[PDB]
Amino acid sequence: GFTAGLTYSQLMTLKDAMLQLDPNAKTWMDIEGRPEDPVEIALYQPSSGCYIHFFREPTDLKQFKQDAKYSHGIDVTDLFATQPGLTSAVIDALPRNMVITCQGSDDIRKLLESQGRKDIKLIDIALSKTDSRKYENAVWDQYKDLCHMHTGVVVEKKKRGGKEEITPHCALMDCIMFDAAVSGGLVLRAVLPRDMVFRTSTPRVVL
């Protein structure tokens, strides 16, 4: 038995980082991509400002391209360097019986259950679409430097008329804006090291 993808030292570094979480603080979680094949993951604790944020290369390119066009605007080339096994290792390290808050619990439930974490309790805050996006503009304005990965034009599917571009959906900004909507208004600290979420790329001769 073992944790796939990460070597032991990486794993102990992650384990130590994860202990920066307050196990009882309100904790948001949000993902981009389907729960069976997620490409962006974020957890957020407003009280401390602690956030977990990382990415994953998709298994299904076809579905990913649809999601990029209509939801997240992420370019797969920026995902080539992601750390294999990171999603499983992070979720394994979440405190037992932790209470996690989300907007729509269905996808979060599926993802956690696929990791054998049925012990985690979910609160679906169930915001209207409109209510959930009240602080969208404000959040991107203040925190855009925390995520540069949404590079593609994202559009609304329309039956008629002109093209309509929309603001891309980011797991991290989602957490922040759903929390602002709940708290009636709007620093932050990264839990994970940058060299853990992305493997440093280096030159090679193709063999």
List of residues contacting Zn ion (CB under 5 A) = 147, 149, 170
Tell the smallest beta-carbon distance from residue 6 to Zn ion (Å). Answer: 22
The DSSP-derived string for 47-86 is TTTEEEEEE---S-HHHHHHHIIIII-B-GGGGTTB-TTH
Q: Which is nearer to Zn ion, 99 or 190 (CB)?
A: 190
- DSSP per-residue codes, 95-131: PTT-EEEESSSHHHHHHHHHTT-TTSEEEE----HHH
Shortest Å distance, C-beta 26 to Zn ion: 21
- Residue with smaller CB distance to Zn ion, 111 or 147: 147
Nearer to Zn ion, 19 or 103 (CB): 103
Contact 115, 89 (CB under 8 A): no
Residue placing its CB nearer to Zn ion in the complex, 39 or 120: 39
What's the min distance (Å) between Cβ of 44 and Zn ion?
12
> With contact defined as beta carbons under 8 Å apart, do 175 and 183 qualify?
no
Nearest distance in Å: CB 53, Zn ion:
7
Beta-bridge mates of residue 53: 42
Output 112 or 173, the one with its CB closest to Zn ion.
173
Residues flagged as binding site for Mn(2+):
30, 32, 174
The tokens describing 144, both together, are: 């855009």
DSSP 121-164: EEEE----HHHHTTTHHHHHHHHGGG---B-S-EE---SSSS--
CB of 174 to Zn ion, least distance (A): 9
List binding-site positions for Zn(2+). Answer: 40, 147, 150, 170
Q: Would you list which residues are annotated within the binding site?
A: 30, 32, 40, 147, 150, 170, 174
